[PDB]
Amino acid sequence: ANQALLLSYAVNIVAALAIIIVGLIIARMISNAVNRLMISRKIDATVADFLSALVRYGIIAFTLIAALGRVGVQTASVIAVLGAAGLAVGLALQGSLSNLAAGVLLVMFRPFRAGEYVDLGGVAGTVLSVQIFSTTMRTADGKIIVIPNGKIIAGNIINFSREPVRRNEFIIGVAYDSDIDQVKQILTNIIQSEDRILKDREMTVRLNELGASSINFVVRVWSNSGDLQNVYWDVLERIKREFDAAGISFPYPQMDVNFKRV
């Protein structure tokens, strides 16, 4: 009998569907325009994508509110349900968002770059790449370590490769009866005859400690980062050979034994 009400309900459903379609199209267009505008301003691609996604989902939320109000759902109900859904999605994506922001910061400020040897909170290796959510490094023995970006930015970043010049330290323990001046001059000759040691830097050769069984000399010399390990090995071998040749003894653990027979 009352055919007007059924027609009104049908036209309301059709209007809601039309609103949904038009709103989705408008959201896509506006989000794409905003993304292109942000990219043209040299803003980072990840940040632009995040902001454009926010814009698109906001416009879609407006469209959903309008359509559901058309089919009789109140604005407060739609807002509450969308808020609950967004809270659930945000709880699911909180860690991913933290890692995403951290990766953006890592790429932007470059505390380390690919190819550099770093120590990221107890693990050390050569950086391979900083991905969207985590950074991959390869250790000296060939292991692959994947570290989330947020964990990296939250802690200390120790970069071994950033400075072109680094320092070697030698701790040489010789017998107490060794001549101090002879040890000093032999070590000084060894480090002066080495061309890869920078002569304009610190060249410390000092007696450092009176140990339990030996007197320890400290040698601190600087070299280019690509020569540090080779310099250490060569200087150590030369120290061994020249101390053996000069009679300077590397002492075994000492022990004064007071003999008492009962």
In the complex with ligand AV0, which residue's Cβ is closer, 62 or 133?
62
Token pair listed for 213: 């069984």
Q: How many residues does the chain have?
A: 262
Site for a second copy in 17-46 (CB under 8 A): none
Q: Are 208 and 216 in contact (CB under 8 A)?
A: yes
In the complex, minimum distance from the CB of residue 2 to a second copy, in angstroms, rounded to a whole number = 16
The H or E element that residue 68 is part of is: helix 45-70
**Residue 259 lies near a second copy (rule: CB under 8 A):** yes
Token pair listed for 214: 């030996």
Query: Which listed residue (20, 34, 166, 196) binds a second copy by CB under 8 A?
Result: 166
195 binds, among ligand AV0, a second copy, none (CB under 5 to 8 A by kind): none
**Residue 15 lies near a second copy (rule: CB under 8 A):** no
In the complex with a second copy, which residue's Cβ is closer, 45 or 95?
95
11 binds, among a second copy, ligand AV0, none (CB under 5 to 8 A by kind): none
d(CA 98, CA 104): 10
Q: Are 23 and 62 in contact (CB under 8 A)?
A: yes
Site for a second copy in 80-139 (CB under 8 A): 80-98, 100-102, 105, 109, 111, 123, 131, 133-134, 138
**Residue 190 lies near a second copy (rule: CB under 8 A):** no
Token pair listed for 248: 């300077």
Query: Which listed residue (107, 145, 198, 246) binds a second copy by CB under 8 A?
Result: 145
- Per DSSP, the three-state class of 216 is strand
Cα Rg of the chain (Å, integer): 35
Token pair listed for 15: 């209007």
> Which chain residues interact with ligand AV0 by CB under 6 A?
8-9, 12-13, 23, 26, 59, 62-63, 66, 71-74
